[PDB]
Amino acid sequence: AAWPKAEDPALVQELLDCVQQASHYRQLKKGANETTKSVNRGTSELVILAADTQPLSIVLHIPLICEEKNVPYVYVPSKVALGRACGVSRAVIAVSLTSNEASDLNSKIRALRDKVERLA
Amino acid sequence: KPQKKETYMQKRAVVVGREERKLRDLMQKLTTIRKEKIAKRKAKKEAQREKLKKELAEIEERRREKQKKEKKEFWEREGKKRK
Amino acid sequence: GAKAGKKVIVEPHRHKGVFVARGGKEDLLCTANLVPGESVYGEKRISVETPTKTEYRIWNPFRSKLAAGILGGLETIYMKPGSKVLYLGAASGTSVSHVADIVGPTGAVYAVEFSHRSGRDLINMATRRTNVIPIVEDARKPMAYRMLVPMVDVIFADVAQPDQARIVGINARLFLKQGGGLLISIKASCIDSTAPPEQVFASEVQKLREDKFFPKEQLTLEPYERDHAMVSCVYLQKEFEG
Amino acid sequence: PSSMFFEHNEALVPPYNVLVDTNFLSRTVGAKLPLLESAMDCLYASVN
Amino acid sequence: EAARLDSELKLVGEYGLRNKREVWRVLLTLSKIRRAARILLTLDEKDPKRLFEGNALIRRLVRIGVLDESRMKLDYVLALKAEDFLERRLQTLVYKLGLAKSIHHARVLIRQRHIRVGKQIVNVPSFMVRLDSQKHIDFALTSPFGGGRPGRVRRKKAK
Amino acid sequence: PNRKKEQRNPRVKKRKKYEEKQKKLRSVKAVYKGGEGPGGYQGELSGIKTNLVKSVKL
Amino acid sequence: ELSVRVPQLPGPPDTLSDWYNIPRTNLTPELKRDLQLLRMRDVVAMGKQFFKKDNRKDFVPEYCQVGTIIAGATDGVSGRLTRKERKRTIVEEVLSSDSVSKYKRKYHEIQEHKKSGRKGYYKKLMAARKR
Amino acid sequence: MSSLRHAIQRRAHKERAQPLERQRLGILEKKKDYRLRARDYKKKQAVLKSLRQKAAERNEDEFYFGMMSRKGPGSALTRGKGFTGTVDGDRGNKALSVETVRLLKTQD
Structure with a gap:
């Protein structure tokens, strides 16, 4: 079902790294409801979805809206490790990041979404 | 010339209604503010247009100055050659 | 908000079929929906007691880039009511329904989508609306729906892919009438995401001219979805229809 | 034109696209100068 | 050169600098860097001078984090510019790291010496930052945001 | 001749002229300015003229 | 199967074929009023909004239908008019809204400044003279 | 030039009001108000003059069709x-x- 899964070899690690960057940089919505609201406001730049979840249907409906908006998403394999990367003290299955158009973080995100677009 | 008689039309006219009267009063005051605002904005637009055409004629005068200097340069550099 | 219940007026816009409804302190855009009375996705709608069967749908720009274009005032959107339109990138069908309501019964729009469940929403709407043909396949291999798509006149495209120009180019090679037309939309961040966007647009339009297209309009849907564009070209002639 | 500002082009960042005109091409051969090298040096960036 | 005028103004306005002196100065820095980039392209590929000197300069730039850790080649060394040098200019980091609401408020903060990098408080807002240091920027202990004394206005209002 | 605050600090004067020019830019072209409203979509909140084309003809 | 037919031989179009049957607009006075409102919608939003300068010499389109904003499924808590709030004509709605106070005040102002000195002032001078 | 003038140099003057032994007889027509009264009187008198040329250069036997479909002025006589x-x-x-x-x- 979750066929655009992210592969292991440190690709997930650059993902979690940029998640840490954006979580410090406040460009971040956290939790699935925040993801849906961000993508339905269209501010989202990219969204990461856990696959380690009690049933996957949540991170199956979220790709429906990001497919409805044509903005990228990617399946991390670990909800716990994603929550730790965000710094929540709690596991998170869905984290999204928006755009702020004056940085090089945006260059990083451009690279990352190029990676996931080549994954798809 | 305005009428001093009173026509059958004017007598047979109906007295208007209250909601109608509120509506018409609103419409009146609406048209007034509309016309005066269009007057202010048209006046300001006209003053800036006149300003700008003054600077266009000024650049025309400068054009004539460079025209004078250039043509005299041409014919002074031309006269000795024919001389 | 132009809240629910406000009496408004509707008039034709410039384009054949689309309508513009003005009112109060806020105007908007609508279309006469073919399928009566029913909303699709919580879109707002409009009823007029004609002197029952007369219903329009408000068209959010920010959800649908064709609507962004109709607000941006395109030159000629090529889609008359009653025209054959290959849509491309038909994700969940909202905009597609709008094009359906444009072309009406005597028109037909071929709605192609890549993924599945956005397909499910699309085909649900395809059951309902009797002029939009569901096609769920890989857009890169149009010989798959070569069985379905006849020669059409107008090509919508809104995919966000690197090979987008070649996608719509072979789809032009396969499914576009002599003197054809197309609207596509482009994101800088998905064609090449470091460069300046105008330069990216010039690269894409030069590509289409290498695909033998005649570029004939461009705009930038500027106050609505940053650094995108809508581009209008004509297939293999300088004039549009014939 | 989008990506523009009050008669400044925010657009043209490196690399730069440069159109050759005919007088220019004749004259740069007539002055015997390497096209890509001299442009790269005078602009201090990459061209085509 | 109205384009020069408006371009310099947009530089300052996007990053609230003070004068075209400071802007032209940073441009001069960029000019020296792109001079280096031109030279190291003038030597052809796989040359040893080219290899070591270009590797050096790219390490310099990524050490101050201006050129991205993604792109590490002389092409992008040419392709850098003033917006990027201003990005690693300091006051911008206070604004993008969320202590001062505005770039001007950040300028005032840097004046009255409330932020530090590592140990020492900073007074010059054009103190260039490093990639290795840029997250270690916070208020000092002596500033009422960081603590210490509550401040003179709190002092007088308590008076 | 007497002058103003706005002149007396050449830090401030390029703040305001940068503000007003950016306001001046908000006359001619179109800036992005966020998405649709967080409460929702509310029409084209300032009108639609039909007969106006703003397309660059290539 | 084949019968005798009927012969039925006894201007500008009335329902536009290429816009899904929009009828020709009936000229009723409240409709005229609504049209005047939507043209002068600038001054209605006094101070807070501005509008695209729609400027023809006429203002009446040949084809228009008065309708109803139906419903917000995603939102109906406050984007829904109340029963008292619902109005027949758009003009009565913008009447029944607020701020018509500020309208009236602007009205007295503009009225005074067009009654600046034109005739009443001259009459009162004439009284100060003849006294 | 236009920075060869001091500040108090460009400080210009302020009109003198009507004296308050008099004000019951009307505001004081200074220069601008005089110009306005002039130009109104002027365009009106030139309209009057052109009409006078027409009324001394009428022809009595004109003929129109209006004269078949309006009343006439006439005179006090009728x-x-x-x-x-x-x-x-x-x-x-x-x-x-x-x-x-x-x-x-x-x-x-």
């Missing part, structure tokens, strides 16, 4: 007390014939 030389028209209403009047009466 018009009475109530005569300016205006050519009237209608005000808008005519002899409204009987049958429609009956219809009106039934409605009322």
Whole structure:
């Protein structure tokens, strides 16, 4: 079902790294409801979805809206490790990041979404 | 010339209604503010247009100055050659 | 908000079929929906007691880039009511329904989508609306729906892919009438995401001219979805229809 | 034109696209100068 | 050169600098860097001078984090510019790291010496930052945001 | 001749002229300015003229 | 199967074929009023909004239908008019809204400044003279 | 030039008000108000003059079709007390014939 899964070899690690960057940089919505609201406001730049979840249907409906908006998403394999990367003290299955158009973080995100677009 | 008689039309006219009267009063005051605002904005637009055409004629005068200097340069550099 | 219940007026816009409804302190855009009375996705709608069967749908720009274009005032959107339109990138069908309501019964729009469940929403709407043909396949291999798509006149495209120009180019090679037309939309961040966007647009339009297209309009849907564009070209002639 | 500002082009960042005109091409051969090298040096960036 | 005028103004306005002196100065820095980039392209590929000197300069730039850790080649060394040098200019980091609401408020903060990098408080807002240091920027202990004394206005209002 | 605050600090004067020019830019072209409203979509909140084309003809 | 037919031989179009049957607009006075409102919608939003300068010499389109904003499924808590709030004509709605106070005040102002000195002032001078 | 002038140098002057032994006789027409009264009097007198040229260069036997379909001014001789030389028209209403009047009466 979750066929655009992210592969292991440190690709997930650059993902979690940029998640840490954006979580410090406040460009971040956290939790699935925040993801849906961000993508339905269209501010989202990219969204990461856990696959380690009690049933996957949540991170199956979220790709429906990001497919409805044509903005990228990617399946991390670990909800716990994603929550730790965000710094929540709690596991998170869905984290999204928006755009702020004056940085090089945006260059990083451009690279990352190029990676996931080549994954798809 | 305005009428001093009173026509059958004017007598047979109906007295208007209250909601109608509120509506018409609103419409009146609406048209007034509309016309005066269009007057202010048209006046300001006209003053800036006149300003700008003054600077266009000024650049025309400068054009004539460079025209004078250039043509005299041409014919002074031309006269000795024919001389 | 132009809240629910406000009496408004509707008039034709410039384009054949689309309508513009003005009112109060806020105007908007609508279309006469073919399928009566029913909303699709919580879109707002409009009823007029004609002197029952007369219903329009408000068209959010920010959800649908064709609507962004109709607000941006395109030159000629090529889609008359009653025209054959290959849509491309038909994700969940909202905009597609709008094009359906444009072309009406005597028109037909071929709605192609890549993924599945956005397909499910699309085909649900395809059951309902009797002029939009569901096609769920890989857009890169149009010989798959070569069985379905006849020669059409107008090509919508809104995919966000690197090979987008070649996608719509072979789809032009396969499914576009002599003197054809197309609207596509482009994101800088998905064609090449470091460069300046105008330069990216010039690269894409030069590509289409290498695909033998005649570029004939461009705009930038500027106050609505940053650094995108809508581009209008004509297939293999300088004039549009014939 | 989008990506523009009050008669400044925010657009043209490196690399730069440069159109050759005919007088220019004749004259740069007539002055015997390497096209890509001299442009790269005078602009201090990459061209085509 | 109205384009020069408006371009310099947009530089300052996007990053609230003070004068075209400071802007032209940073441009001069960029000019020296792109001079280096031109030279190291003038030597052809796989040359040893080219290899070591270009590797050096790219390490310099990524050490101050201006050129991205993604792109590490002389092409992008040419392709850098003033917006990027201003990005690693300091006051911008206070604004993008969320202590001062505005770039001007950040300028005032840097004046009255409330932020530090590592140990020492900073007074010059054009103190260039490093990639290795840029997250270690916070208020000092002596500033009422960081603590210490509550401040003179709190002092007088308590008076 | 007497002058103003706005002149007396050449830090401030390029703040305001940068503000007003950016306001001046908000006359001619179109800036992005966020998405649709967080409460929702509310029409084209300032009108639609039909007969106006703003397309660059290539 | 084949019968005798009927012969039925006894201007500008009335329902536009290429816009899904929009009828020709009936000229009723409240409709005229609504049209005047939507043209002068600038001054209605006094101070807070501005509008695209729609400027023809006429203002009446040949084809228009008065309708109803139906419903917000995603939102109906406050984007829904109340029963008292619902109005027949758009003009009565913008009447029944607020701020018509500020309208009236602007009205007295503009009225005074067009009654600046034109005739009443001259009459009162004439009284100060003849006294 | 235009920075060869001091500040108090460009400080210019302020009009002198009507004296308050007098003000019951009207505001003081200084220069601008005089110019306004002039130009109004001027364009009106030139309109008057052009009309005078026309009325001394009429021809008595003109012929139109208006003269088959308007009243005429005439003179005090036939018009009475109530005569300016205006050519009237209608005000808008005519002899409204009987049958429609009956219809009106039934409605009322």
